[PDB]
Amino acid sequence: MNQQKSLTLIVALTTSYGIGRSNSLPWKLKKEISYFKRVTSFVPTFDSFESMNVVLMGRKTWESIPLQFRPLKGRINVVITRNESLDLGNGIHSAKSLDHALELLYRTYGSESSVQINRIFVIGGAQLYKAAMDHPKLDRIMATIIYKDIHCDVFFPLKFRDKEWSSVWKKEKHSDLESWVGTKVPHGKINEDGFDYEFEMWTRDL
Ligand SMILES: NC(=O)c1ccc[n+]([C@@H]2O[C@H](COP(=O)([O-])OP(=O)(O)OC[C@H]3O[C@@H](n4cnc5c(N)ncnc54)[C@H](OP(=O)(O)O)[C@@H]3O)[C@@H](O)[C@H]2O)c1
Numbered sequence: 001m002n003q004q005k006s007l008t009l010i011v012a013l014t015t016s017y018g019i020g021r022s023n024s025l026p027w028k029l030k031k032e033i034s035y036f037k038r039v040t041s042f043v044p045t046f047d048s049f050e051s052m053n054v055v056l057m058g059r060k061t062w063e064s065i066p067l068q069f070r071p072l073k074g075r076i077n078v079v080i081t082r083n084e085s086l087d088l089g090n091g092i093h094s095a096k097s098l099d100h101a102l103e104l105l106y107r108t109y110g111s112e113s114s115v116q117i118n119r120i121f122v123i124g125g126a127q128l129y130k131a132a133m134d135h136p137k138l139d140r141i142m143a144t145i146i147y148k149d150i151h152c153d154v155f156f157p158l159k160f161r162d163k164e165w166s167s168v169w170k171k172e173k174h175s176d177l178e179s180w181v182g183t184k185v186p187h188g189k190i191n192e193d194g195f196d197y198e199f200e201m202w203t204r205d206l
């Protein structure tokens with residue numbers, strides 16, 4: 001009703017959990033951002049017909065997206081904003097919280113809609129990530145680990161890859177990362193512009 005479906009978080013972070021610098025992400029990875037795009041927009045061939053995915057983001061991340069690239073295409077965009085100062089858009093929603101956002105979609109994309117909702121992704125930032133991390137429906141984290149201690153001023157709020165969260169969060173086999181993303185993806189380290197990174201999938205039991 002409020003939330004029927006599971007939520008998925010997607011992030012690119014350093015080994016120190018740094019995610020941004022100056023209202024921007026501190027690196028330029030074309031193949032990396034390409035991955036974000038195919039994950040956040042992939043719906044099965046048959047479900048391909050009606051279905052669109054949803055990306056939920058906090059106000060600042062909204063602003064941090066290149067003007068040329070937003071709203072993020074082929075996805076339903078929703079910005080979480082308490083203030084709701086300006087909630088502009090030609091078909092893009094606003095919502096007071098994560099729960100409010102879930103209910104607006106269920107309401108907007110019910111049976112009286114052509115286009116049905118497939119998967120829901122939280123794309124950040126840190127404040128929205130903190131809220132998702134405490135949501136009873138978030139069970140999966142699509143993370144990109146960047147093996148470089150790049151200077152950041154914003155951090156991922158929970159050390160899910162640390163020993164203290166190891167009985168809760170588990171890293172999945174690559175084979176099931178590829179099955180969930182539905183495309184094959186590069187295994188192990190990837191080098192692009194001097195940075196080494198890797199794709200991972202973590203899951204927790206609800
Ligand atoms: N590396 C990555 O994968 C990645 C992914 C996303 C973001 N980032 C980076 O992280 C930074 C953006 O992060 P951020 O923490 O500063 O901001 P954020 O979460 O993007 O936006 C903060 C705004 O979002 C709203 N908000 C967030 N959670 C909310 C909740 N539970 N209830 C109500 N409103 C909520 C509030 O909006 P109002 O002020 O409108 O009320 C708050 O001011 C940028 O540097 C961005 O590049 C990196």
Ligand SMILES: Nc1nc(=O)c2nc(CNc3ccc(C(=O)N[C@@H](CCC(=O)O)C(=O)O)cc3)cnc2[nH]1
Nearest residue numbers: 010011012033036037065066069072073123124144
């Ligand atoms: N894995 C991952 N990498 C990221 O860079 C990332 N970034 C955010 C937040 N910031 C951003 C910034 C820009 C665009 C963006 O323009 N994406 C375009 C592709 C743009 C391009 O081809 O250069 C899109 O269409 O998704 C998305 C999210 C959230 N989760 C992430 N997750």
